[PDB]
Write a protein that binds this ligand. Structure first.
Ligand SMILES: COc1ccc2c(c1)N(C(=O)OC(C)C)[C@@H](CSC)C(=S)N2
Lengths: 558, 430
């Protein structure tokens, strides 16, 4: 059942040649299953025996996947796939269920063995050459070519997608408002015509196709509603995912954990309120798929908290091109936020989360805005529209982290709402130094090979101090040194900083961190009435310098 | 209905392959605008659909250039140029007239519709294959090839260069003081005339441009507060430096002076012969910052001497045509940014303050994108090349909104800044 359509032109990558092999000699039983096989294939005119004259070859596999009644074969166009030219990949991802529409009735047609009909270019076929030798080398040259796009063959999937497109071209032209989608081996036909008035076009389709070389065994309209689309579970008016059974053990390896980590994420398109955070935080020690790991109490906390929602199934509505598209973002804490996209209030379109990670010390407003994009970017990747924004952030705190920040930023139609974890500015610094306030010339240091340092200060009224530190970074240290400095100050203070690094850290005003040290400063900052920092060149001249780095002296020679 | 002219063979540089870029998905409003364009132009024999045997790709946008009414197409041929044109920069150079900058005022016209008339080399065309996006990855992208010379490409005017010269001839000798640079789809035109004379001296060129080949300058119309009537006239003779402002009265407090030495400390790698100790000494002590402590006798010298190295620098100004300029910008106030085009760090080639109003739409990204061009037409006008832009912005935020305020042809190369800069302080040049 060869098609009668304009084939597509393929050459192998310039310079390279088609493959030439010689297969592993096989016996009586293997050859019988293949002769028989190729004959009625040749019969459908899918292949053609050629002669000695064709140079190139490839091997055959005469498999049995399950151990069922119909023997079958296959050829691994391994070497050919190396050689053959490059194509415009069709596998350009997938369309996302959220953003699909509500097309009353729909059917899917299996175009599975619908490639073998599509004809190969008349010049390449020679390359697809394979030989069927016998047991007693009585007939060494029983070789066949390949007239249609073979199984696997780099371009097959690339081309078949193209041919078929030109194929439904007039039908999609005559029957306009019906709508076909295609991927792999599944055809989804859909309309807003009552079942029978729908089955027409499907049958019409089932025929049109038949006229073009390709069959579609489907029967009376074929398959309907419970849809296992690329994992996704879809229903004529709602979507979600179905088999998603993340279990548990008493001794897991990162191996299985990865999986656990995946599922949770996957399930994150739909189920409002999921996090992977802690379960993944621990993943860090990337050794082999043999090493095991102690699922912490923080991880199982989440491993269990997440199962509750995921315990009881949540639904997904479809897109309605007229209705408002919108989203608002809630913060799940630990730098984690959750967004929900909706048209009709409480009608769940889509949900997902933004977790600023693998790069510490980050500000909140900033993170708010970061996710907004995650959305902006995603809302176009699907609705080609920008969600109106319902966001938990006052205007005046925004107008400030808009005009405060350096990296320029932008946020479209956003509106204000209330919700407990309201975001905003806990603190801020000063621009001009404070009058009368005490002036603290801080300093730190460390043993560049001995692990220790000393944090401390000296105020302008002759207020000195130090605190010997250990197992610390020249950074941590010059950081820690500001905490003291902080502590031993009353209400409105002035700090003169040795370090760029920390000055920068404290410029941005971030917040939470596993580094209790940075946090501890935050709170100081948070409690102070007026904090003014200032900064000066280390080795050069940090003001009182001579004395400062000199009172913190241990081991140095300069 | 056709008249086959003949082609100048375009071939692949240093063994490369053709660009296999990915198309940024885009608005539906815009995914419409591109079919409404590409088809009517597919009619016009300009463009054509290709099959799967062609894997090559390239970006397509959709702007509204002169104002708001109809859309414009645009292409990021940035990989093809980065492919071919570093051989068709040789084989087909188009030289930069260095008196370009020397002129009073430079205007520019989209004399780019003009290359649609030249057939493109059949055997090359495969490398101009673009694609048009579908909403939600449903339908397989609408895929076209280029039959003529793509208005995007850098290899185009290379070719049509010829006709450009031949077509300008009578003009060039009627008015010889005027120079013209054919950059991109750009006809850079400058003169030492009044803002009324060069303005006319231009249309004169427009008229000529219609007659002699119905090549066409798109109608000049828009009215921004900076009274842009007819003519996008950059005035290069306005090129004076005034960024690095020392505070007039700031040598009063410990703080001011504490600032004053740090600033002086950056300048140290720019003007290395900098003397600042006897100033620093003024603050060698752990003192209160709000303490009005006046200067020392010998300190004024270090301020004064260094305070006169400004009005006259040397060896910076050295451009290397075998290296690539880098522009880097940074935000400041509500509408005042800054850029520094160097090429080898601290070696400034050109600097400036992208201004704009206080009561105006303080949209960062309007400024940033619009800042960027302002850099660029100057970087063309002066060197005739595009700066690697080190951008103060989220990758994904820019990859989501430039296409909005980009009323320009060429899409200069770009990078985005990871860490913050101290530089901003007050107007400072890195
Ligand atoms: C219950 O199944 C569905 C429910 C809604 C939709 C679909 C299937 N869609 C589709 O092609 O299915 C996969 C390939 C995504 C398409 C039209 S299919 C005729 C649209 S716009 N909405």
């Amino acid at each position: 059942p060869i098609s009668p359509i304009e084939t597509v032109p393929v050459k192998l990558k310039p310079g390279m040649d088609g493959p030439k092999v010689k297969q592993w000699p096989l016996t009586e039983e293997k050859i019988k299953a293949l002769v028989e096989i190729c004959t009625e294939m040749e019969k459908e005119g899918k292949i053609s025996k050629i002669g000695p004259e064709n140079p190139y070859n490839t091997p055959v596999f005469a498999i049995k996947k399950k151990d069922s009644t119909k023997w079958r074969k296959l050829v691994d166009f391994r070497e050919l796939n190396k050689r053959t030219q490059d194509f415009w990949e069709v596998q350009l991802g997938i369309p996302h269920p959220a953003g699909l529409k509500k097309k009353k009735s729909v059917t899917v047609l299996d175009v599975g063995d619908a490639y073998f009909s599509v004809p190969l270019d008349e010049d390449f076929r020679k390359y697809t050459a394979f030989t069927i030798p016998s047991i007693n080398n009585e007939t060494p040259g029983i070789r066949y070519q390949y007239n249609v796009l073979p199984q696997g063959w780099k371009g097959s999937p690339a081309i078949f997608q193209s041919s078929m497109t030109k194929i439904l071209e007039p039908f999609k032209k005559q029957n306009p408002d019906i709508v076909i989608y295609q991927y792999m081996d599944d055809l989804l036909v859909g309309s807003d015509l009552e079942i029978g008035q729908h089955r027409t076009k499907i049958e019409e389709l089932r025929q049109h196709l038949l006229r073009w070389g390709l069959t579609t065994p489907d029967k009376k309209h074929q398959k309907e509603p419970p849809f296992l689309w690329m994992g996704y579970e879809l229903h004529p008016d709602k979507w979600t995912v179905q088999p998603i059974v993340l279990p548990q053990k008493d001794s897991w390896t990162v191996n299985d954990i990865q999986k656990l980590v995946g599922k949770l994420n996957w399930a994150s398109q739909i189920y409002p309120g999921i996090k992977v955070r802690q379960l993944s935080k621990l993943l860090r020690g990337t050794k082999a798929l043999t090493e095991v790991i102690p699922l912490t109490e923080e991880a199982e906390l989440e491993l269990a908290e997440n199962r509750e929602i995921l315990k009881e199934p949540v639904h997904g509505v479809y897109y309605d091109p007229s209705k408002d598209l919108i989203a608002e973002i809630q913060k799940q804490g630990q730098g984690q936020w959750t967004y929900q996209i909706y048209q009709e209030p409480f009608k769940n379109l889509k949900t997902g989360k933004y977790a600023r990670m693998r790069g510490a010390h980050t500000n909140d407003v900033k993170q708010l805005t970061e996710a907004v994009q995650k959305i902006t970017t995603e809302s176009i990747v699907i609705w080609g529209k920008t969600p109106k924004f319902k966001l938990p952030i006052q205007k005046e705190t925004w107008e400030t982290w808009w005009t405060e920040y350096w990296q320029a930023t932008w946020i479209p139609e956003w509106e204000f709402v209330n919700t407990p974890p309201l975001v905003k500015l806990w603190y801020q610094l000063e621009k001009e130094p404070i009058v009368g306030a005490e002036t603290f010339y801080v300093d730190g240091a460390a043993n560049r090979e001995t692990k220790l340092g000393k944090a401390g200060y000296v105020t302008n009224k002759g207020r000195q101090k130090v605190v010997p530190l250990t197992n610390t970074t020249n950074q941590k240290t010059e950081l820690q040194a500001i905490y003291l400095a902080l502590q031993d100050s009353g209400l409105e203070v002035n700090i003169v900083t040795d370090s760029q690094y920390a000055l920068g850290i404290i410029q941005a005003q971030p917040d939470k961190s596993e580094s209790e040290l940075v946090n501890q400063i935050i709170e100081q900052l948070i409690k102070k009435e007026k904090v003014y920092l200032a900064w000066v060149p280390a080795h050069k001249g940090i003001g009182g310098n001579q004395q400062v780095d000199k009172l913190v002296s241990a081991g140095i020679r300069k | 209905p056709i008249s086959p002219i003949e082609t100048v063979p375009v071939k692949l540089k240093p063994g490369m392959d053709g660009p296999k870029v990915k198309q940024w998905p885009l608005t539906e409003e815009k995914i419409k605008a591109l079919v409404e364009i590409c088809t009517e132009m597919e009619k016009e024999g300009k463009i054509s659909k290709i099959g799967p045997e062609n894997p090559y790709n390239t970006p397509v946008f959709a702007i509204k250039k002169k104002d708001s009414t109809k859309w414009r197409k645009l292409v990021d041929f940035r990989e093809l140029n980065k492919r071919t044109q570093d051989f068709w920069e040789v084989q087909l150079g188009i030289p930069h007239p260095a008196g370009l900058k020397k002129k009073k005022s430079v205007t520019v016209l989209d004399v780019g519709d003009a290359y649609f008339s030249v057939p493109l080399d059949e055997d090359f065309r495969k490398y101009t294959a673009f694609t048009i996006p579908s909403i939600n990855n449903e339908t397989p992208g609408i895929r076209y090839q280029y039959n003529v010379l793509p208005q995007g490409w850098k290899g185009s005017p290379a070719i049509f260069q010829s006709s450009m010269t031949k077509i300008l001839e009578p003009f060039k000798k009627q008015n010889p003081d005027i120079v013209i640079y054919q950059y991109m789809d750009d006809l850079l035109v400058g003169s030492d005339l009044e803002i009324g004379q060069h303005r006319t001296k231009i249309e004169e060129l427009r008229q000529h441009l219609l007659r002699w080949g119905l090549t066409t300058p798109d109608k000049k119309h828009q009215k921004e507060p900076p009274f842009l009537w007819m003519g996008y006239e950059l005035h290069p003779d306005k090129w004076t430096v005034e960024p690095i402002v020392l505070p007039e009265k700031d040598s009063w407090t410990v703080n001011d002076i504490q600032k004053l030495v740090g600033k002086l400390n950056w300048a140290s790698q720019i003007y290395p012969g900098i003397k600042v100790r006897a100033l620093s000494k003024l603050l060698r002590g752990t003192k209160a910052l709000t303490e009005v402590i006046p200067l020392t006798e010998e300190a004024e010298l270090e301020l004064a001497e260094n305070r006169e190295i400004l009005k006259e620098p040397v060896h910076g100004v050295y451009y290397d045509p075998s290296k690539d300029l880098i522009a880097e910008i940074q935000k400041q106030g509500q509408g005042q940014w800054t850029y520094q085009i160097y090429q080898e760090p601290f070696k400034n080639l050109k600097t400036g303050k992208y201004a704009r109003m206080r009561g105006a739409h303080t949209n960062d990204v309007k400024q940033l994108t619009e800042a960027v061009q302002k850099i660029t037409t100057e970087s063309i006008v002066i060197w005739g090349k595009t700066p690697k832009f080190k951008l103060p912005i989220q990758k994904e935020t820019w990859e989501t909104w430039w296409t909005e305020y980009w009323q320009a042809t060429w899409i200069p190369e770009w990078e985005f800044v990871n860490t913050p800069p101290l530089v901003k302080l007050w107007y400072q040049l890195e």
